[PDB]
Amino acid sequence: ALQHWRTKIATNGREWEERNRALRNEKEIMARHYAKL
């Protein structure tokens, strides 16, 4: 239904947040490592 589609969009947003935050954090930390080297 429309409510089910809204729930699917919400799940997609939650997965976006789960996948991007840690990747960006790791990128930043080892970029700091790059800068030190």
Binding site: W5, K8, I9, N12, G13, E15, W16, R19, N20, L23, R24, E26, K27
Partner: peptide
């Protein structure tokens, strides 16, 4: 909608991986 948000999800994460 669903198609565009899925495409944005995909290209954002593939950019993250390739930069990594």
């Amino acid at each position: 909608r669903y198609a565009e948000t899925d495409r944005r999800y995909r290209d954002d994460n593939m950019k993250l991986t390739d930069e990594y």
